[PDB]
Amino acid sequence: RHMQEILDAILSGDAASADYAALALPESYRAVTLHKGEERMFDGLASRDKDPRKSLHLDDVPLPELGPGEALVAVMASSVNYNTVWSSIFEPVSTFGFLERYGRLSPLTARHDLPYHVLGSDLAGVVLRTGAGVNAWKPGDEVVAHCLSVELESPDGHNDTMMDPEQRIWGFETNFGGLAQLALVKTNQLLPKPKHLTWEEAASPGLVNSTAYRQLVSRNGAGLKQGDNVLIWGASGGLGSYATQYALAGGATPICVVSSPRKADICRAMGAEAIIDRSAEGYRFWKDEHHQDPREWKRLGGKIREFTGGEDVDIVFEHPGRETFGASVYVTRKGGTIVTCASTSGYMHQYDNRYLWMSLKRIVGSHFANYREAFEANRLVAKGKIHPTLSKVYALEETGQAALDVHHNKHQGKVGVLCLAPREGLGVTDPELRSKHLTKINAFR
Amino acid sequence: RHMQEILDAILSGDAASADYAALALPESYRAVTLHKGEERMFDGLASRDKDPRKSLHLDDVPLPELGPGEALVAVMASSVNYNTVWSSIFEPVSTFGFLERYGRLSPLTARHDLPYHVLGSDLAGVVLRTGAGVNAWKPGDEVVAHCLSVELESPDGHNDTMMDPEQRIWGFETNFGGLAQLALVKTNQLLPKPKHLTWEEAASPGLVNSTAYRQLVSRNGAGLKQGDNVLIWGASGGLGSYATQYALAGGATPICVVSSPRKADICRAMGAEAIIDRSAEGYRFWKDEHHQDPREWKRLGGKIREFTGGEDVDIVFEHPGRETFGASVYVTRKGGTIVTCASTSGYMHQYDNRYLWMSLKRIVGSHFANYREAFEANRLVAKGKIHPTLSKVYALEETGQAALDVHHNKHQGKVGVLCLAPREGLGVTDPELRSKHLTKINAFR
Amino acid sequence: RHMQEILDAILSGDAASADYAALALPESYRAVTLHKGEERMFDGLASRDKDPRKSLHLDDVPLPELGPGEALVAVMASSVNYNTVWSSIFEPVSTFGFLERYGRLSPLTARHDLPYHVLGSDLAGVVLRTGAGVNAWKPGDEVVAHCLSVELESPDGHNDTMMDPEQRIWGFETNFGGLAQLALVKTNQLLPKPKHLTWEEAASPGLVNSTAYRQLVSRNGAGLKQGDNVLIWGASGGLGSYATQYALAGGATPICVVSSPRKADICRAMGAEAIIDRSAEGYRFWKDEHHQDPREWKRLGGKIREFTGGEDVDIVFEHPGRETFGASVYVTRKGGTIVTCASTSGYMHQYDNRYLWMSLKRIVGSHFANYREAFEANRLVAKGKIHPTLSKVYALEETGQAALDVHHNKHQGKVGVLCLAPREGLGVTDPELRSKHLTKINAFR
Amino acid sequence: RHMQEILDAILSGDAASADYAALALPESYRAVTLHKGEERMFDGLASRDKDPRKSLHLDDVPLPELGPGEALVAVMASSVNYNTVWSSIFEPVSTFGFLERYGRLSPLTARHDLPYHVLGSDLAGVVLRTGAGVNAWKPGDEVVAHCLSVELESPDGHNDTMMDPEQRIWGFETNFGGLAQLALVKTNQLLPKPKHLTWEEAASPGLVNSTAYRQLVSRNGAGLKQGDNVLIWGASGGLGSYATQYALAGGATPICVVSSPRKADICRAMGAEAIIDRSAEGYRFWKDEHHQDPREWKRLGGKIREFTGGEDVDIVFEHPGRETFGASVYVTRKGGTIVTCASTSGYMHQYDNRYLWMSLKRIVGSHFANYREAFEANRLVAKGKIHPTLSKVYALEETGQAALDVHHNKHQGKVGVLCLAPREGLGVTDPELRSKHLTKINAFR
Ligand SMILES: NC(=O)C1=CN([C@@H]2O[C@@H](COP(=O)(O)OP(=O)(O)OC[C@H]3O[C@@H](n4cnc5c(N)ncnc54)[C@H](OP(=O)(O)O)[C@@H]3O)[C@H](O)[C@@H]2O)C=CC1
Ligand SMILES: NC(=O)C1=CN([C@@H]2O[C@@H](COP(=O)(O)OP(=O)(O)OC[C@H]3O[C@@H](n4cnc5c(N)ncnc54)[C@H](OP(=O)(O)O)[C@@H]3O)[C@H](O)[C@@H]2O)C=CC1
Numbered sequence A, B, C, D: 001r002h003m004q005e006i007l008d009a010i011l012s013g014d015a016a017s018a019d020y021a022a023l024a025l026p027e028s029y030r031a032v033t034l035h036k037g038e039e040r041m042f043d044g045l046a047s048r049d050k051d052p053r054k055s056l057h058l059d060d061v062p063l064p065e066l067g068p069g070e071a072l073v074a075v076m077a078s079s080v081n082y083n084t085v086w087s088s089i090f091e092p093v094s095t096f097g098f099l100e101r102y103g104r105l106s107p108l109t110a111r112h113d114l115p116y117h118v119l120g121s122d123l124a125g126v127v128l129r130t131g132a133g134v135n136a137w138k139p140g141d142e143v144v145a146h147c148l149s150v151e152l153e154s155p156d157g158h159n160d161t162m163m164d165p166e167q168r169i170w171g172f173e174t175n176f177g178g179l180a181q182l183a184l185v186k187t188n189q190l191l192p193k194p195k196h197l198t199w200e201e202a203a204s205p206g207l208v209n210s211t212a213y214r215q216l217v218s219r220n221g222a223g224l225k226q227g228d229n230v231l232i233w234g235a236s237g238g239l240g241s242y243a244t245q246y247a248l249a250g251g252a253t254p255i256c257v258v259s260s261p262r263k264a265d266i267c268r269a270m271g272a273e274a275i276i277d278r279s280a281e282g283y284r285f286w287k288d289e290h291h292q293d294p295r296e297w298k299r300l301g302g303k304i305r306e307f308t309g310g311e312d313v314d315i316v317f318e319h320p321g322r323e324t325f326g327a328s329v330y331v332t333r334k335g336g337t338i339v340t341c342a343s344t345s346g347y348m349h350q351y352d353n354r355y356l357w358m359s360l361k362r363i364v365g366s367h368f369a370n371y372r373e374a375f376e377a378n379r380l381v382a383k384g385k386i387h388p389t390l391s392k393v394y395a396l397e398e399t400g401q402a403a404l405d406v407h408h409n410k411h412q413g414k415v416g417v418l419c420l421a422p423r424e425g426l427g428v429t430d431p432e433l434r435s436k437h438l439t440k441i442n443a444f445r
């Protein structure tokens, strides 16, 4: 096959850029999709009964016609994140309503409104053909993908593309995701693949890594500096693990909170010492449904002061929202910043404002990451200061159980999946760098 | 009485520094105070029936001993602030708690832990005597005073004195307040008296104006900018009256929220066009005790777009708190700031975090201002760009009446208090500069 | 003649979008042109004997093809910026330098290097057709176009598009600039055309006014706040005419620097009072080619303190470069900001670093404005807050004389140029708003 | 002797705060002092020839009266700075000249108006007596000192105490410095002693460490973040050594410039990989006394890139000044920061402003450090993330010889001076944390 010929080119390790420019398009590429008719076959099932292995079809799909500022990507590996499972489960709504309302933009965007939806918001691969006006990416380049597609027509997002109102998540709100052998992205979603990682490790950190980078490291978020103390609220989790790594490498002290010594172990494995087991310590910040227990804030406060010897956290890395958020405002040191990018336990937060104004704290909402923030996060991955958190890797044919595993926190870390890659372990090109931190790269395994 | 010999020296106009330095110190002075035999007199009862007239006393108290870095000041006039209302009704907790808890600590701070507490967080007057090490001021100096008391012994407040862990509010978290004939003040709260205002006018702005300056104008606050749209709650009130002015003088367009049509015309007198009488529109942002009404939020946003031309506010000047805060978060422009220095209607804020993280908004805590911001605020008053909003003056014997006027929303500007000044109209040493801005000066009548 | 149809359809007052969409395009258009033939045929003599009239050509150049994300705009009027001065003057190097070898990249960047260069970096006109991918802008939309041009596939520009390494400047560092009949722009350069202004008025602020806004008003620049003092060099000129408006409207104090009592009195007209004439005081900041005299800085510092009653300027709006920059750093208040967007008198700046590091000042380089800043500056104009500063108006044929008058300082604010607009005075569709500020709108003529 | 009991108290351990309070103060203490009658012995002679061994007296001296907000310190160890070297030298001005009229200030200040000047601006010792009002420190606390004295009577330094006009460096512009066995300092000069260092090591970080901290790390300085690239000039020197450690502890990449292989290796022992021998590469940034050689700027930029792999530096840690500044401004990344602190080779800076405004770079001036920056800089030392750069220790008797060594660059790191301490190596109360950093602590061996 032609599909075969390209894989051999990637695997050769000697295919020049022009070699790639010479490989022919296959008319089809297998894909993990959803079919527009199977929407309601799932309405009325709980936290687990709606199931992803049923609505996930492995289709042979026609190749999209590319246009300006876009790249066809041969996908070695991708992943299954939260939006992937949710779409596979048609939560919250049906992603075909995204594809159709996003089809009202232009004829090129109409390409996305199709009977099927190719899922996938991550990507590690080789670019094959680039569209009109592309200059920055030659065929043959090893890439990962930032999953924020911005159109950038309104002026809003020209001092921060995260402000741009037409922001879409590639593979979730547009089509041609990465859970597939071929893919189409905007070249301003492409990032240089780190040479010391596997294909599967390379596309693992993804949105969750850049999201924590902007929230913790960038000046749009809390502007971590060396010496800061930072409370991190789900440290072994996706967001928290990378947020832990950034604290350590930025020169700061993570304080990691967890709900099992299994989770506590992964933070030690990453470099953390100061770890709180919120379940071991019996924290009940809400005495009921409507009222909080301010002594439960104070109890965590003093527990924090144990690992630090008196100081409070300059920064709280928030995301559980409703349950944690009262305490996280309380515990923050005077003039400190609470930064939020999610509200998993409930989006209606309640806090004691006295603690905000009298102590001059600030809550700063954060969301995803712009391309420059996504770049610098991927950069820190590429330089060896931040590490992928892969745990299980699947094969393309079994993306269902890939997404039922994530559907029930079956793993502690990320779930990658080989696409064109025949087996795991390929991709490296800087084995030295890889051997310097092998110890931590596969910590979540 | 040595006190009348002090007042007569002010009223002369030619008493120089050597004359105040020679004048004899009284042994007692008249002061409004709370007693620690009355500290729970109001307990178990509706916050509203809690009458300030039943808790405030006219007393004679002995002169305090002056420590290093302090000015003893003969107070011509002071003002009623909302923090005096709260002292007067022992909410949210009595002020004798932190009088004791900063009292017998260092011996010097032990001078404040008295059975009585004189209030008054503004003053305008003449320096009587200075403690050791004072160089910037001398007896006879004409002075107004802000209410920040910082020890500045900690490292923490040396990049912004507000972060001093021991920053107090003078006359509220400390004794020897300015609702009184003499006040005991750190020299680093002193600022020169605006020579065109009267005694009671000049004592009007210092607390509230400074706060609104840090909150709105400062880079430590919302860092407003010309052309911003700014939602200003309680826009005729204390903070509102200077906040509106800062939005106006800054080239911003305010949307002034008021509770009354007559008070909707002081804003137009002030220069504002965008006025929302919240009692007229009848917002019920809270459905019950525990549930807000997001459609009342949206109705508020609709009325703002009415004025701005479909634009959401860059900045919301918050201070109503609980009742208002949900709405405040909703209508704020994407990337906008919710800057809060208070919680009048309740400090247990609740809000939809989804509008904050996903729209990249910020809730910035504010609290008074550092000496630099107070200097800058008063400097603006002195230049005739910002103007006092004095509406009524009471006498030191009727201070408890005034506190009631503002406890209930009875009066909505700034209500003054004569201390040693026996009439109004005393104080102007710059008649011509006062002749230019008289109409705005007398705008709050 | 096709060009007539367009101008006729524009000149009417009911031309629908489908009117402009059906209209036929001319095979060519009149345009002001530097010739790469005359590259070094004026190389050797001083650039003043290089009168701009000799190098600028009026050529009937053909239409380039309308590329994606681009718009073909019929241009009623442009303006002269002195980035056209040393376009014509060919200094420090010819514009064809960073034009010619930018083709081997993408073929669509190659259209820009011809043997000719259409200059001009302002525009008021009407869009003809839109490139691929463009939804926001429709034929018949009346638009101004600021001159920021960014490809934005590099990630560096995604926190602010002006950190794009491919940020060029249309008409100065690209082809097909505003001094023509039609213009080829990126649609992300298009802004609402203020509807109360004429074609020529609406075209004048674009460049200088965005630069000034970003340089002085945005946090990316000086960050003006109310009460600042602001030394504005060239307050009369194209940059200064907006800076002065920003100082006054943001509530700060401008100290205006001019070289003619005529330009003083128009500054006084705009509302300023603290005015200095660098002809009259006779400032020699340089004793010779290589040395300065702090006696003269001090004397400049002296005069400034006359106006402000003892206060040094927080902000210096710099741009004359080497002759003033040394004086500008000395004069600025401690903790203050010298912000700089060019170097008219020469780019090798010389300053005494003691005044910088010991006084905590900062020098901030500014360049143009990202789209958001361009939209905020144009929004203020449109809102009637900032006014255009048109001086003279020329027809396109006499652009060389326009550039010569500015290149000699024989001018005041902005020199306009008619392109398609047969006569001055056309374009106004809000005479109500127009007739409210006409005295300040025509202040400069 | 009274002094031996104090020493004995300290060397014992044991001595509780009570016993330190009970111990008897000496009538006098031994000290190094300048004599008011000697300001002119080194008149007309080369600075190299001027000899502190003749100027520096070893006098027994009465201790001053203990003022408010002041602490009496038994200094175990001190250091010698360039500020100290110039004092011994009577350069630039006579340091007695400053005492005589800062004495003329308050009667408190007047205590420094002596015919002798105890020099010494770094401190390692034990608090003996507190003055009035002190709450943070008690008799027996182990302290180092920040050498900045601020009055703070002015509001200018209440947003950052470096803006306080009446600011002095203790032991240079105040008397009772730390080259003595007792020293008198304000309480807000005091920092806790890193428990793992010896007395002379804990006195070596001092002003150069905190200056580097504020210039690089603080948001008053460059605000470095992890992943940043930083050109550090003189990276083996005082500023540069600490600047290098700050780049490495915060997860950035220092690019160290040095002028010999023997210093290049010191940088490697500190942790630096990228190092540039200035004099090996032979950079002649100045063709002569007036013109620069920009292709030497370019060659510096080329070598930096070879280290970063293509990336220009986000931050240049400047301080050499005229010789280096053109290159510093040239090679910094688009949108990055030159942070300058001093100008050793010359304060008359010259640079091409084209690269400043067009690439949106900023020159930020920084001076010393406020107390919060000094606390945080000291604290990172205590964390064991920053280490002191001591290379040689003298006894108090040899302070004159020590002063010549630094005056003749006889050493690379800092020259400690034992004061009360008998031998080297005393003072470590945390041997385990010392063990884990030992080779880095002694890396200036
Ligand atoms: N990644 C991104 O870019 C963005 C993600 N989001 C949100 O991310 C998802 C949230 O999961 P994500 O962080 O990405 O990865 P995870 O699936 O690993 O998140 C699980 C973590 O959340 C913590 N947690 C959950 N509930 C609580 C609680 N009641 N109290 C304390 N901690 C709690 C848990 O910590 P513990 O071990 O202590 O139980 C757990 O480790 C949302 O679906 C949404 O997408 C939002 C914006 C951006
Ligand atoms: N943190 C700090 O440093 C400082 C904080 N403050 C705070 O400001 C106080 C506000 O009062 P102040 O500015 O002194 O002068 P006022 O009391 O006169 O103004 C408060 C205004 O807020 C409006 N308001 C009251 N209740 C509500 C409500 N439930 N919803 C919406 N708006 C309401 C009212 O105006 P209307 O009814 O007409 O709309 C009232 O005028 C806060 O309580 C707090 O004390 C003040 C100074 C400093």
Ligand SMILES: NC(=O)C1=CN([C@@H]2O[C@@H](COP(=O)(O)OP(=O)(O)OC[C@H]3O[C@@H](n4cnc5c(N)ncnc54)[C@H](OP(=O)(O)O)[C@@H]3O)[C@H](O)[C@@H]2O)C=CC1
Pocket: C081, C082, C083, C207, C208, C211, C233, C234, C235, C236, C237, C238, C239, C240, C257, C258, C259, C260, C263, C278, C319, C320, C323, C324, C341, C342, C343, C344, C345, C366, C367, C368, C406, C409, D357
């Ligand atoms: N970085 C960028 O992207 C942009 C920069 N610019 C700026 O344009 C120039 C400002 O001029 P512009 O607004 O375009 O129109 P002008 O060139 O006409 O205005 C320049 C003003 O600078 C005044 N000036 C003051 N001192 C000197 C001096 N020592 N030597 C020469 N002129 C002096 C001039 O006369 P007078 O004394 O009467 O005031 C003149 O009015 C700046 O140099 C800069 O290029 C403009 C747009 C964009």
Ligand SMILES: NC(=O)C1=CN([C@@H]2O[C@@H](COP(=O)(O)OP(=O)(O)OC[C@H]3O[C@@H](n4cnc5c(N)ncnc54)[C@H](OP(=O)(O)O)[C@@H]3O)[C@H](O)[C@@H]2O)C=CC1
Pocket: D082, D208, D233, D234, D235, D236, D237, D238, D239, D240, D257, D258, D259, D260, D263, D278, D319, D320, D323, D324, D341, D342, D343, D344, D345
């Ligand atoms: N009156 C004066 O002379 C002035 C002195 N200064 C000083 O600046 C600060 C320097 O601090 P500090 O680090 O402790 O001094 P150090 O003695 O510890 O070393 C400073 C480093 O500066 C480097 N350096 C010296 N000259 C040059 C040059 N021409 N180009 C590049 N690098 C150079 C050298 O590094 P290497 O040789 O290895 O490359 C030298 O080691 C001082 O605090 C002081 O204020 C500042 C302004 C004026």
